[PDB]
Design a protein around this ligand. Structure first.
Ligand SMILES: N[C@@H](Cc1c[nH]c2ccccc12)C(=O)O
Ligand SMILES: N[C@@H](Cc1c[nH]c2ccccc12)C(=O)O
Ligand SMILES: N[C@@H](Cc1c[nH]c2ccccc12)C(=O)O
Ligand SMILES: [Cu+2]
Ligand SMILES: [Cu+2]
Ligand SMILES: [Cu+2]
Ligand SMILES: [Cu+2]
Ligand SMILES: [Cu+2]
Ligand SMILES: [Cu+2]
Ligand SMILES: [Cu+2]
Ligand SMILES: [Cu+2]
Ligand SMILES: [Cu+2]
Ligand SMILES: [Cu+2]
Ligand code: NA
Ligand code: NA
Lengths: 683, 683, 40, 107, 147
C-alpha cells in the first residue's frame, strides 16, 4: 500500500519504500475511477488505453534510447506529473510499482521527483543502489548470487582467491578489482575514470535535469539555461577525459569517421536481470554497413541541417518558425535544437526537423530487433553506461564541431569584456596536489532475490557489499591575493588545464582553451586595498562527497539538491605521477554582469556552474578563439602546478623485505594492486 | 574419500560420486609417498613438481585449446593413466578432485576412462549434466539461480511469462526456447541443429576417442584407424549440415578467406562459472589483423607443408622420417599428420613439423591474454562449443581441400571394385519420413550451488530442469530386394543425400558425392535366389536414443560403449517441409574385403562406421571423383524420397477457433512455437 | 499452394529416380524435359 | 567491367590451387631441382635444363610409363581468376569467356 | 629488462625473455667462502665513451679496436622518469664451458659479448622458451631497480 505522507521525512520513507527490491514488487485505489484526480484528462486516458493494449513486460529490459520504450515512459511520467497533490502522486506511484516494468517505473518516478515542485527536500537512493546491474561488473554479481544460493558456504580456498569475506555473520564483502582480462585497447588504461559509478550517475542526472522529450512551455525547466548547461557539461566531461588521458601520456581523442572504422573495441562486462549481457564489440569495426544505411542517411540529414544553418545564420523549422543563429545569446536556442528542449508552436504536433536517438545505431550489433520489447541494449543504449564506450566519446568529439563552428563565427572577446579596471591578481598559490586509490563499499543487496521470509521482513538476512577501488585526492587550499581600488562584488573562476601535449610541446592558449576544466566558481566581496581569498577543496562549488548508504537514512540538510547536480570529489583532480605531472591553473576575477529567469533556477536549486551568479556565457573566457593582443589582462593569472600520486598499499605494510620475486594472486592484476602480491609458495 | 570398488556397478557409483557437484568438491593417501604405485616414475615426478610450482586455480576456466592448459591436463592424464590397478586409480582421482581445477580434472578423468583397459563397462554422465554451463543458454541458468535464491518464491506473473513451474514441490521446470533476440545472420536459422547438445557431445567424444596429444606407441589407439575415422566424422558432419541447410533453401557454405572478412557473426549465449560470458562477434570482421599476424604466418606454414607434400607425393618430417603420400592406404598417415596422432622416433621430443591449436586465433577477440590462467575462451576455444560458430564450419570447409586434393590425385575406382558379380538390387522402398519438434528434459542441478545442509545430503532439495525443444523423427523401415546367385557374406551401405541444389538444378553424382551421409551400414548373409532385407531405424548402426538421467542410474547392458560413439536419433533425418522436401537415398551391397589391427578396435568397442566390418576406405564409393562409364553397376541403387515435417502444437489442441489475430506471448518467438500464441487481451 | 502439371497428365506407373534432363541447366520446373538415360 | 577484384569467395578454391603451382615452381628454381609425383627428380641447374622447366610449366613432361593420373602441376586454372563465376564449370552449357579459348585469349 | 608492460601488468619471465638486454658479461675467479664482485659502469664490456675528434689525433692505446665494436656509454640506460621508472636486473654466474676457432676472434680483437669467453649460445639463458620448473636456480638472481 502507499505509505501515508505527513512530513518530508515521511515522504522520503515512502519514496525509499517504492524503490526497495524493485525486482520483486509486492489495488484498492481504482485508477480508471479517479480521472478527476489529475490536472490533464488526456494524459490519464492515453495511459489507460495504452495499458489496456499492453506495455513492456516486467521480465524485459527497459532501454533508454528505444523510441517505443521512451514513448511508454513518457506516458507514465505524464500520468505521475499531473497528480493534483502529493497523496495522489504516492497512490499512483504505488499502483504503478506493481503493474509496469521496474526500470521504466524508476525512470518515470525519478523524472517526476526531479521536476515536481512539491517533491523538494526529498532524498533518493543512488541509481546503482536501486539497480546495481547497470553499474557493477557481472562477475561480482555472480559471486553475490553464489553466496546467496549457498548462504555463505563457500570453501576457504575459493573465498581467499576471490577475496570474499563474511563480517559479523551479517555482511558479505566481495573485493572488486578491474583487472586486465577484458582488455581491448590502450583506452582501457583510463577505465578507473570512465567506468566510475559517480561519473555515469552524473550523466544520468544531467539527462534527468534536462530531458530531451520535455519540450513544452508548461514545464518550468523551459525558463532555465538548460541547453547551454547540457552542452557545457558534455564539454567539461570531454576536457576532464583529455586531462586524464594526458596523465597517461596519451593524445587527445579524434572524431569518429562514419565512413571508416572504429579502432577501439570495448567489453561492457554488464549483466542484465534477464540473464543476458551487453554484447562485446571487436576492434576495427566498420561503422557504416548495409544493415544501418537507412539510419546513416537520417544522421546526415541532421548534420546538414545544423552546420549549414550555422553558416547561414538562421534555421527554418518544420513548425514554420525561423530561429536566428547570429547573436551570441542565440547559443541557447542552438543547444535546444541539438540537445533537445526546443518548444514549437502550441498547435504543432509530431516529429520536428531534427530526429533523436540515432547515433547508437552506428555502434550497434544490428537493427533487426530494434523497436521490440526483447531488444538487448548496448553500452550506448543507456545514459548510465554511455560514457563507458570510447565510441560515445568520439561521437561527442564529432558533435562538438557544431558549437566550435558557432563560436568561431562570433566576434572575439574584447579587452573591455575581459578586463576588470582597478582589480589585479597579485599571486596564486596552492598546497600539494596528491592522488591515491582507496576502497569504497557499494550496497548491491537489491541485485539478489529474496525468499518469502525475507520478503515479509522487507530485508535480506545478509547484506552484500562490493568493495570497489576508486580514485581519491587529499584536501588542498587555493590562496589568491587581489588588489582592489574600490569595494565591489566580483565573480572568481578557477580552471585547471594542460601544460604539455602528448609530444611534450609547450601548449599555447588557443590549443588549451578547449581543455580547460572550470574547477571552481564563486562570488566574493572585494574591499579597498589587499584581499586574501582562501578556498578549501571541501567547499568547491557543486562538488559532493561519496554518496552515503540509503538504508542508513543517508547518515546534512542540503544533500537532497546537492546530490542531484554534484560532481564527485574523488574525480576532482586527474591521476598524477610519482614524480609529478605538470598542469596549469588559471584564475580570473570579473564584475557581476546583468526569456530566461534566474529566479526559476534559484528556486529549484539547479545552480550548475555560474548560472545563478552572472549572465556570461558558460565556458568564458575560453569558449571563443582568443586574440593574444586583447588577452592577458591584469585580472587574470596563470600558475604552474604539479600533481603527484602515491601508493598506500605498501605505505602501511612497512616491513624490511624485498619483493623482487613476489607474484600477484591473480595474473591479470595491475601495478595498482601491489597489496595482492604473494611470495611464490610451494604446495 | 575414494569409495571402494567391488564390481562394475560399484565402479560406476564411484565415478558418479567423483563427477557430482564438481563446483563444490568436498587426504589420508599421500601422493608423494606412493610413487611405486605407478608404472612410470617420470610422470608422477613431473606432476608433483608442476603441482608444487602451482597449477590452474579452481576459480578459473579450463580452455581446451590453450597450450598451457592442455599441457597441465596431459600431465594429470598421465598421472591417472599409469596407475597400476583400479584401486590406485580411484584413490588418485579422489586426491585430484579436491586439489585441481574441476574442468581439467573432468577432462583428464574422461580421457583416462576412455583409454583405460580396466574401465570397460562403466557408464558416465553426459558432459552437459556435469557442466551445464557449456551447453545451456545463460538466461536459463540465470532463472535457475533466481529460483534457487528465492527458494521458488517467484510471483505468478513472472513464472507465466518465463514459463517456469514447480512440480510436486520437488522439481523446478524452466521452459527453454531459442528465440530470435540473438539473431546475427541467416545461418542462425539452423540453430536447432548446430546448438543441439548431442551434436556438441558427439564432437567432444570424437576428440576424447582420438586425442591429438596422444601420439605414443604405447597407447592402444595407435593401432586403430583413428585419423581416417576423425576425418570421416568431420566430413559427415559437414554433409549433414549441408542437407540441413538445403532443407531451408540455403546454398552450401564457402571456405573462409583469411585475406578477407567473415560475414557471419555469432552470439554464443554461454555463461562461465567465473561470471563472464563468451564474447559476441559482430558481422563483417576482418580475419587477419596486426594483433594476430604472427599466428597467421604459422598457419600458412602448415598449409604449405601439407598441400605441397600432397602434390609431391611425400613429406619430410622434423624427426628425420619421410612419409609417403602416393598410395590410397597412405590416407591414414596423412590424417595423422593433419588431425594429430602421428608417432615420431622414440628418442625424438618437442614440437613436430605441424603445429596445432592455431585456427582459433583467426576468430578470437585478441591475443593479449593468451597463455594465461585468466583467458576468457571463445566458442572456437572448446570442442563442446566449436560447432556452434559458423566460422568453425567454414574453417572445416577450408581444411577439407587437403583431403579432396589427395583423393583427386588417386586413381578413380574401377568397375571391378564397384561391382559385385552375381548380385543385383531389385528395388528399395521406405516408409514415410516425418520430422517434428518435441520436448526433452535436461538436468542442470549441478549448475547451482548448495548450502551446508544440501552438501551433507549430497543432493539439492529441489531438482532444476530445463525443458528444451529438439528435433525428432518417427520410426521408419527400409526394405531392399536383392537377387543373388550364390550364398555369401556381404556388406550393405545406405546413404542419404541431396536431390536438388539451392537453385533448383538436378544435381549430378560428382557434385553430390561430397554431400552423401552414410546413414546405415551392416553385414548380411545373402542366399541363392531372392532376399528381402528389412532394416528398422531403431537398429541403425551407432544411432542412440536420448541420453537418460544419470541420477536415476541410467534408467541396456551395452549403453556404456554405445553412448561413447553414438549419433543422436533425433538428428537422423534433416527437417523436412510441410509439402515434402525431396532427397535421394543410395544403397550398395559389396563383398567383404580382406600396421592396424581390427581386433584392437573390436575389443575396445570403438567400431565406428565399417572399421570393424571391412577394409574399404571410409566414404566409399563417394570419396573419389567418379567416372560415369565405370559407375552405376547392378549392385547399387538410387531411390527418390520425400521428407515431411508436422506441427504437433495444434494437432492436439483441436478447437474450432480462428487464430488470425492471436499474438505470441514473447515477440521473439518463431513459427515453431505456435503453442505460445495467446489471443490479444485487455487489462 | 503450388502444383506441377508436368506429371499430373503424364500418369504412368514408372519410377524416375534415375532419369536425367535433356539439357543439364534445366530446373525442377521442367520435369517434362526429363529423359531416361539412353545408350547410343 | 573495369576495376574487378580478381580473388573472391566463389573462386578461392581455385586460387589456392594456382598458388600450389607457383610455390612448386619458384622454390624449385631456387633449390635447383624439383620432386615430381611420379617419383622422379628433375634438375634445374644447367642451362640445357630449361627445356624440362618449360615442359613442367607449359606441359609435355613425360612421367613414368606405368604412372597415371594428374601430375604435380595442374593446368587450366588461370582463367578462373577472370571468369564471371564457377557455378556452371564442368558442364555442357558453360558459356566461355575470352580467356577460355586459345583463339580469343590474346584479345 | 622490463618490469611492467604498457598496460601495467606484472610481466612473466616468458614474455620478458625476448626483452632482456645483456648489459655486462665478464670472467671472474671465485674462491672458497664469500666473494664480493664490484663492477663499475666505466669497465663494462664493449662500452665506449664519446668518440674523440680525429683532427686532434684522438686526444688510450686500445681505442683502435674498442671503437670498432663498442656500444656508446650514453645509451647504456634507458631514459627514466622524474619519479623513477621501474626495471629489473638479472644476474647469473655459470662455469666456463668448452669449424670455428676462438683464437681467430681473439687475434682480431672482435670479442663481442662472450664469444671469446665461453661457448654457450648468445642470448643464454633467455634465447629459448623457459620451463618454470627447471628455472630459478640458486646461481641466478633478480633485482628490482628504478631509473
Ligand atoms: N564546476 C562544476 C562541477 C565540476 C567540477 N569538475 C567537473 C568536471 C566535469 C563536469 C563538471 C565538473 C560545477 O560547479 O557545477
Ligand atoms: N553412420 C554413423 C553414425 C552417423 C549417422 N549420421 C551421422 C552424421 C554425422 C556423423 C555420424 C553419423 C556410424 O555408424 O557411426
Ligand atoms: N653488451 C654488449 C654491448 C652492448 C651494451 N648494450 C647494448 C645494446 C645493444 C647492443 C649491444 C649492446 C657487448 O659486450 O658487446
Ligand atoms: Cu598509464
Ligand atoms: Cu512539424
Ligand atoms: Cu519489501
Ligand atoms: Cu575533492
Ligand atoms: Cu528456414
Ligand atoms: Cu623435431
Ligand atoms: Cu556431495
Ligand atoms: Cu532415429
Ligand atoms: Cu602421380
Ligand atoms: Cu655508461
Ligand atoms: Na568487427
Ligand atoms: Na566489377
Amino acid at each position: 500500500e502507499p505509505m501515508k505522507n505527513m512530513d518530508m521525512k515521511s515522504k522520503e520513507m515512502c519514496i525509499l519504500k517504492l524503490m526497495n527490491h524493485i525486482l520483486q514488487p509486492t489495488k484498492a485505489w481504482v485508477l480508471e475511477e479517479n480521472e478527476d484526480k489529475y490536472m490533464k484528462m488526456e494524459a490519464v486516458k492515453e495511459f489507460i488505453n495504452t495499458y489496456k493494449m499492453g506495455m513492456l513486460p516486467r521480465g524485459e529490459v527497459f532501454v533508454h534510447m528505444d523510441h517505443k520504450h521512451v514513448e511508454e515512459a513518457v506516458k507514465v511520467f505524464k500520468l505521475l506529473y499531473f497528480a493534483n497533490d502529493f497523496d495522489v502522486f504516492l497512490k499512483t506511484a504505488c499502483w504503478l510499482r506493481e503493474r509496469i516494468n521496474g526500470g521504466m517505473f524508476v525512470y518515470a518516478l525519478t523524472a517526476a521527483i526531479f521536476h515536481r515542485s512539491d517533491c523538494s527536500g526529498i532524498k533518493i537512493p543512488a541509481p546503482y543502489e536501486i539497480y546495481p546491474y547497470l553499474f557493477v561488473d557481472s562477475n561480482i554479481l555472480h559471486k553475490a548470487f553464489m553466496m546467496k544460493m549457498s548462504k555463505a558456504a563457500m570453501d576457504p580456498v575459493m573465498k581467499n582467491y576471490y577475496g570474499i569475506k563474511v563480517k559479523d555473520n551479517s555482511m558479505v564483502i566481495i573485493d572488486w578489482r578491474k583487472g586486465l582480462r577484458h582488455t581491448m585497447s590502450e583506452f582501457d588504461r583510463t577505465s578507473y575514470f570512465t567506468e566510475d559509478i559517480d561519473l555515469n550517475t552524473y550523466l544520468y542526472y544531467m539527462h534527468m535535469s534536462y530531458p530531451y522529450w520535455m519540450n513544452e512551455d508548461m514545464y518550468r525547466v523551459n525558463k532555465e539555461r538548460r541547453g547551454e548547461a547540457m552542452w557545457y557539461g558534455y564539454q567539461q566531461l570531454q576536457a576532464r577525459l583529455r586531462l586524464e588521458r594526458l596523465s597517461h601520456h596519451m593524445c587527445d581523442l579524434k572524431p569518429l569517421d562514419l565512413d571508416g572504422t572504429l579502432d577501439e573495441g570495448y567489453w561492457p562486462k554488464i549483466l542484465l536481470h534477464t540473464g543476458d549481457e551487453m554484447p562485446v564489440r571487436y576492434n576495427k569495426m566498420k561503422l557504416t554497413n548495409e544493415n544501418n544505411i537507412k539510419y546513416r542517411l537520417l544522421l546526415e540529414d541532421n548534420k546538414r541541417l545544423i552546420r549549414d544553418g550555422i553558416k547561414k545564420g538562421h534555421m527554418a523549422m518544420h513548425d514554420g518558425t525561423t530561429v536566428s543563429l547570429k547573436k551570441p545569446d542565440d547559443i541557447e536556442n542552438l543547444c535546444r535544437i541539438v540537445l533537445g528542449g526546443f518548444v514549437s508552436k502550441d498547435d504543432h504536433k509530431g516529429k520536428s526537423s531534427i530526429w533523436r536517438n540515432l547515433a547508437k545505431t552506428m555502434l550497434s550489433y544490428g537493427t533487426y530487433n530494434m523497436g521490440k520489447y526483447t531488444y538487448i541494449p548496448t553500452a550506448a543504449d543507456m545514459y548510465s553506461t554511455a560514457l563507458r564506450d570510447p565510441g560515445m566519446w568520439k561521437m561527442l568529439k564529432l558533435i562538438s564541431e557544431y558549437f566550435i563552428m558557432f563560436k568561431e563565427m562570433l566576434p572575439k572577446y574584447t579587452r573591455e569584456e575581459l578586463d576588470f579596471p582597478g582589480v589585479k591578481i597579485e599571486q596564486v598559490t596552492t598546497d600539494k596536489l596528491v592522488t591515491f586509490m582507496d576502497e569504497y563499499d557499494v550496497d548491491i543487496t537489491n541485485a539478489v532475490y529474496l525468499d518469502h521470509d525475507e520478503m515479509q521482513k522487507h530485508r535480506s538476512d545478509m547484506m552484500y557489499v562490493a568493495r570497489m577501488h576508486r580514485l581519491n585526492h587529499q584536501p588542498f587550499k587555493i590562496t589568491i591575493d587581489v588588489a582592489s581600488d574600490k569595494a565591489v562584488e566580483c565573480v572568481v573562476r578557477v580552471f585547471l588545464g594542460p601544460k604539455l601535449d602528448c609530444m611534450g610541446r609547450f601548449t599555447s592558449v588557443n590549443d588549451k582553451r578547449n581543455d580547460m576544466v572550470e574547477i571552481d566558481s564563486f562570488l566574493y566581496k572585494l574591499e579597498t586595498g589587499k584581499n586574501t581569498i582562501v578556498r578549501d577543496s571541501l567547499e568547491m562549488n557543486n562538488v559532493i562527497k561519496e554518496r552515503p548508504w540509503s538504508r542508513n537514512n543517508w547518515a546534512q540538510d542540503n544533500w537532497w539538491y546537492k546530490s542531484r547536480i554534484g560532481f564527485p570529489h574523488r574525480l576532482l583532480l586527474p591521476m598524477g605521477s610519482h614524480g609529478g605531472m605538470p598542469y596549469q591553473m588559471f584564475v580570473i576575477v570579473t564584475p557581476v554582469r546583468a526569456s530566461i529567469d534566474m529566479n526559476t533556477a534559484k528556486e529549484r536549486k539547479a545552480c550548475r556552474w555560474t548560472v545563478c551568479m552572472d549572465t556570461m556565457p558558460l565556458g568564458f573566457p575560453f569558449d571563443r578563439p582568443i586574440d593574444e593582443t586583447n588577452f592577458y589582462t591584469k585580472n587574470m593569472k596563470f600558475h604552474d602546478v604539479m600533481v603527484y600520486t602515491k601508493d598506500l598499499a605498501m605505505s602501511n605494510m612497512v616491513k624490511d623485505v624485498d619483493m623482487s620475486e613476489m607474484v600477484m594472486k591473480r595474473d591479470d592484476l595491475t601495478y595498482l594492486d601491489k597489496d595482492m602480491l604473494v611470495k611464490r609458495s610451494y604446495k
